[PDB]
Structure formats: structure tokens, C-alpha cells
């Protein structure tokens, strides 16, 4: 049956939940809890029952009766890459994808796999070549998450991938400019993704290892601080500068590199920033200057009706970079 499902992001820094509902969709509830250490390791859920208890807190905090959910795998658990295949009937395409994907997957095809055509299949004939985006994950990564959700009393309807789910609240705005080339960066705590689009159609995705944790770890090193305290220092201050400079330089290089490899193999007018790592003070200006792309924060909540009597627009805005993904997952939960 046709359920309105919740959006949940099992983030490495924060576990975040969003409830949306109604026919034009409206925000109903949201909640965030810091992720306890040891629960996630390198994209896997190492402590699923402990995650289940954390996710229960979220459902209590949001005060929701909903028990269906869309969530997402960590970017470190999924391989995302495009693959050229001839158009065939759907069951036949699956086998072709699985066959082609086999070469790019550093473990036994034990894998869960999905794909989606980068261009509409109806616009080409049988046998012509189409680019599909393939996603692949270890069955174990998927199993850790489903076991977590089961302990929490939740039923998953979709297991999505963050670089695209983060885009759902921007999609109507990206469709306004169907021919414009846009970049969207999600700087997380565990990874940074980049997605390059034309209008609302992805052209490429790249995931970098470098992220908010790296900035915390450099502050930590530079001042023998604990992670939480280095983290708090990162938030309030943003000399800090001297400790985080090599991270800034390295992130800037890695992002110039990715863009140069996009331009070689396939280039951004404007861009958007999401993810809490994008709020480091001044980062947006730095990245604008250094990548030659006007990069802006953006408010994901505009995708949804927000009741001024229940939420402060000012507060929503502040947490919009961290919540873009959970909001996209909640939008998916109420599709179509």
C-alpha cells in the first residue's frame, strides 16, 4: 500500500530524521542526534542493535507514528560509476549490467546492484548504446543497515545513495535551467561527494575521502585535543587557521583535480554546497575563488511547505546543509 515513508540519514557525525507529508509536501517533524562512536566503521554498521536504540530515540523525539523509512548507504560503502550498455528489454539489461559491472567490483559478484539510465530509454532504439549509473554495495553493508532498521521497528521501502538523495530538494530549481551545468558538493563528516549536472540530469559523480573529520583531526593533532573538543573548537573558531591550512589546501587540490578530470572525460557555471563540513567559516568564498565556480549555500527546505507556527525559518535555514539528505530521503518517501 501507498505509505508516506520517513527520511533517515545514518550520518557519521549526526543521525538525522525528517517527516514530510501531504499532497503538496509539508514538513511535519525533524530530529538529530550525534552518532555514538564505534556504531559505524568505514561505511558498515558495526553495532546494529546500538544503532537501532539510537534510531528509536529519533522516532520518540520527532513524535512520529510512521514506521516506514527511506534511508541511504554511506558513500564509503557504495561504488557509483557510469557504464555504457545497449538498450535491451529490462530483465536482459540487468544481466548485461551485472556482467559489465563485474570487472569494476573488487569483490565477488555478494553484491547488491542497481542502475538507472542517464538518459530516457524511450528516446533510443533496441541495441543503441545508453549510459547507465550503476550503484553497487557489499551485501554485508546492506545487511548491517536492514538489521539496524529491524531493531528500530522500521520497514525500509528504498535504500537510496546520498549524492543523489541530497539533490531531491534542489531538483525543481535545477530543472528551471535545463541547459545550465551545475556542480553540487556535499561535504560530510566521512566523505565529500561532487555531482555534476546539466539541469536536473546528473552527468558525473565523484566521492572524495576528505571531509569534516579531517579538519577536526588536524585541530585535534595540533593541540592534543579529544575529538569532541577539537570539533567544538572547529565550529566556534574556523591558531586554528594554521592547523587547518593543509586540509584547506588539500581539499582545494582534490576538488580542482576532480573538476579537471570531469572536463577531460566529458564545466560548472554555478554550484551549491550542502553538508555540515560546508559551513566552516568562509569556505564557500575560498572554494568560489579557488575553483572559479560561484559556490553557494542553499536552502533545501524551500522544497517543502513549512508552518511558521511550528518551525522557525531562521533555525531551519541554519541546519539546512546537514539536513539536505534526510529531507531528500523524506521526499522520496512520499513519492510520487
Amino acid at each position: 500500500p501507498r505509505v508516506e515513508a520517513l527520511g533517515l540519514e545514518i550520518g557519521a557525525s549526526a543521525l538525522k530524521l525528517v517527516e514530510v507529508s501531504g499532497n503538496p509536501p509539508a514538513l511535519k517533524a525533524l530530529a538529530s542526534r550525534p552518532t555514538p562512536p564505534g556504531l559505524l566503521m568505514e561505511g558498515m554498521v558495526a553495532e546494529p542493535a546500538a544503532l537501532a536504540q539510537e534510531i528509536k530515540e529519533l522516532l520518540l523525539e520527532a513524535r512520529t507514528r510512521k514506521r516506514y523509512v527511506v534511508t541511504a548507504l554511506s558513500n564509503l560503502a557504495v561504488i557509483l560509476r557510469p557504464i555504457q550498455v545497449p538498450k535491451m528489454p529490462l530483465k536482459e539489461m540487468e544481466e548485461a549490467v551485472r556482467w559489465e559491472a563485474e570487472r569494476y567490483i573488487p569483490f565477488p559478484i555478494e553484491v547488491v546492484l542497481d542502475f538507472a539510465p542517464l538518459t530516457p530509454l524511450s528516446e533510443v532504439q533496441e541495441g543503441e548504446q545508453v549510459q547507465v549509473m550503476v550503484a553497487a554495495a557489499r551485501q554485508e553493508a546492506v545487511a548491517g543497515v536492514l538489521e539496524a532498521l529491524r531493531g528500530a521497528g522500521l520497514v525500509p521501502v528504498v535504500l537510496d545513495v546520498k549524492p543523489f538523495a541530497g539533490l531531491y530538494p534542489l531538483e525543481a530549481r535545477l530543472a528551471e535551467e535545463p541547459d545550465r551545468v551545475f556542480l553540487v558538493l556535499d561535504i560530510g563528516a566521512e566523505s565529500t561527494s561532487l555531482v555534476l549536472l546539466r539541469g536536473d540530469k546528473p552527468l558525473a559523480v565523484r566521492v572524495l575521502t576528505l571531509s569534516g573529520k579531517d579538519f577536526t583531526e588536524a585541530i585535534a593533532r595540533s593541540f592534543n585535543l579529544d575529538l569532541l573538543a577539537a570539533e567544538e573548537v572547529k565550529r566556534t573558531y574556523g591558531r586554528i587557521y594554521d592547523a587547518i591550512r593543509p586540509v584547506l589546501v588539500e581539499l582545494t587540490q582534490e576538488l580542482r583535480r576532480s573538476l579537471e578530470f570531469f572536463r577531460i572525460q566529458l564545466s560548472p557555471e554555478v554550484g551549491y554546497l550542502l553538508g555540515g563540513g560546508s559551513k566552516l567559516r568562509g569556505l564557500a568564498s575560498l572554494l568560489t575563488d579557488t575553483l572559479g565556480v560561484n559556490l553557494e549555500p542553499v536552502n533545501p527546505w524551500e522544497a517543502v511547505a513549512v508552518d511558521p507556527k511550528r518551525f522557525e525559518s531562521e533555525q531551519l535555514q541554519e541546519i539546512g546543509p546537514e539536513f539536505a539528505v534526510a529531507l531528500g530521503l523524506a521526499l522520496r518517501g512520499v513519492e510520487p
Binding site: 557504495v78 536536473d200 546528473p202
Partner: peptide, 8 residues
């Protein structure tokens, strides 16, 4: 826009 699902 791309909508994947890696649910088994």
C-alpha cells in the same frame, strides 16, 4: 534526476 534503490 536519478532514483536508485539498493534494497534486495
Amino acid at each position: 534526476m536519478i532514483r536508485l534503490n539498493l534494497l534486495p
